[PDB]
Amino acid sequence: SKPMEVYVSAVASPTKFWVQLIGPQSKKLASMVQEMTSYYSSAENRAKHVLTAPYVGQIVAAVFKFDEKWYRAEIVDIMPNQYNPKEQVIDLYFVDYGDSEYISPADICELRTDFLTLRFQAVECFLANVKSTIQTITWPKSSIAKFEELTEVAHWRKLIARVVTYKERPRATTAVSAAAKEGTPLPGVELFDPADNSELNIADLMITQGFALPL
């Protein structure tokens, strides 16, 4: 299949990360992050959308602590606050970026309906043709750091991705997103940086610098 321009938007490991496709939809995403952030920054607007009795699977608006911007999120789990049983703690999945955070319900609002239009932008992927250097599954922190560096995750670095394989999703050991429960396979991709001067793509770079092993 054909190559596509992407950003790597979030990383768990080289075999679990998220991409956003660059194009009309990424421009619309950036615009939506702007509009949502402007909108939900007003208390009147937030009161138009006060959260009551949240539930798993609900799509909401939430503040991201690290940039004070508002994002679409899916409630993946809800548990009692252990200090404070009168409150809950929410496990959120940011549907357009792919990262997850635990959040207080005080930082969540109902999502204004027209913000649902744009399709969820983050696509979960794994890096094709690699496996961990640890064989006794887990990646060394140095390998994760290296992958984060090569992708420049969350710094808007254009990469070229190509889907070259698929694999079944592992059975879940934690609460997961509704989409991760639909039977859809995970795409395994080649990734390369058109701006780095290497002919090697990111898999081959990681393998030849001892950060990964070939499959």
């Binding site: 990383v11 768990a12 490991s13 690290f66 990262d99 969350a154 934690t174």
Partner: peptide, 9 residues
């Protein structure tokens, strides 16, 4: 467990 994605701009 290396299953949760992280974003740090």
């Amino acid at each position: 467990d290396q299953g949760r994605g992280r974003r740090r701009p």
